[PDB]
Symmetry: C2
Subunit: 87 residues, 2 copies
């Protein structure tokens, strides 16, 4: 349908020194529905999810420059776990 609601999801950051872990609650979307892009040289993170049920958008400022190269993604029961390696 034409009209949708866009929410800002709950997210948290864990700065283990080696890794940066981002966890977001995005219930109501499938994994395929989710897109993450690192921006600003790995300074920043963006999350977009759209599903018939839900719409989510998030901007996150990371502690350190990070690289997409080793990055991994987990989605369980509506919670998204992302781990990135700092550059």
């Amino acid at each position: 349908p034409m009209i949708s609601e866009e929410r800002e999801p709950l997210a948290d950051v864990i700065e283990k020194g080696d890794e940066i872990k981002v966890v977001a609650e995005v219930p109501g979307v499938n994994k395929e529905d989710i897109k993450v892009k690192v921006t600003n040289g790995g300074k920043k993170l963006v999350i977009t999810a759209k599903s018939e049920d839900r719409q989510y958008y998030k901007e996150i400022d990371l502690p350190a420059e990070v690289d997409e190269k080793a990055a991994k993604a987990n989605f369980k029961n509506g919670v998204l776990e992302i781990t990135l390696k700092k550059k």
Copy 2:
């Protein structure tokens, strides 16, 4: 590792015979969820437990509902349950 119980986002919508209650409880597996009906028709009680996240919610229903009746479904961290109004 500190536990705090949380109150889930819930929307209750009633159409016709049915009352549909929607709850977001991400983090939690479906077997870790408990749904029960109390105080005759009026109130619906939801319990979700997992190590990382725990939820409890109680909802006062617009109309009394039979406890036994239900259709319930879980998807991507979202719980949808369908309730029948008392005859």
